[PDB]
Design a protein around this ligand. Structure first.
Ligand SMILES: [Cu+2]
Ligand SMILES: [Cu+2]
Ligand SMILES: [Zn+2]
Ligand SMILES: [Zn+2]
Lengths: 153, 153
């Protein structure tokens, strides 16, 4: 199964996020290309609950968290399903890469198809900050761009 | 269950399409508000296969047609699942309305969540034209705006 999200906004940040999953129990391969970010930085990158673009990136809602866990690092057992790694940006403000993930799926009751991907203006503290906010959003900050995840082939 | 598609493009046409379905076997209520259309006209309006926005409205693909039927009117037994009525535009080029549909669903194997809605520049002939093209697209013409259908609440 394949899916894709086209990240757009008014802040100079834009990109394309691709998803691929063979079957429900297998990892989903997430690959991305994002331009217009701060250079030489780390930016929060997550799957948000709703594929609702009626209000900028606000209507995407909170991080997709069907299991009601706190915000964490991708390799933490306790994390939101939507918690992806911070994306590293080069000297030109470009983030490009790919990774495999076992909580993110394109198939089944927790499918992210119809949900949203959000790229943040700040670094995600992976739930390790000294605030209650760290356990909710990772203090990743504003949402310069986002895109609804649709089915493709 | 609720879903929504935000229609955008570069042709002056834009809008919001809302979807609501209680359970799989029940009708889905589709409501829409679309601005920037030709005034006093009828414009093709359909669910397209892919929620892929990488290439304008082109990457949406063809009409969502899992049952491999020909293009028809909403009330025809033989129609694509994605075949919605032509939307009528007023003197200001605004299309606003709502209807119920039994082939369009937000739940199950034929769910339109993660797919796309496309508003056309031309009138849909409902599969009644004298061409092979009528049975494919209804000769609805260009795609001034489209939007990926995402989950909301
Ligand atoms: Cu986020
Ligand atoms: Cu169409
Ligand atoms: Zn999170
Ligand atoms: Zn059709």
């Amino acid at each position: 199964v394949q899916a894709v999200a086209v990240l757009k906004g008014d802040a100079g940040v834009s990109g394309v996020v691709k998803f691929e999953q063979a079957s429900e129990s297998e990892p989903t391969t997430v690959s991305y290309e994002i331009a217009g970010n701060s250079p030489n930085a780390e930016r929060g990158f997550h799957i948000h609950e709703f594929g609702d673009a009626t209000n900028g990136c606000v209507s995407a809602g909170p991080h997709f968290n069907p299991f009601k866990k706190t915000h964490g690092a991708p390799t933490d057992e306790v994390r939101h399903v939507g918690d992806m790694r911070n994306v590293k940006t080069d000297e030109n403000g470009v983030a490009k890469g790919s990774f495999k993930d076992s909580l993110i799926k394109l198939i089944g009751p927790t499918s992210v198809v119809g949900r949203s991907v959000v790229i943040h203006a700040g670094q995600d503290d992976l739930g390790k900050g000294d605030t209650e906010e760290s356990l909710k959003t990772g203090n990743a900050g504003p949402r310069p761009a986002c895109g609804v995840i649709g089915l493709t082939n």
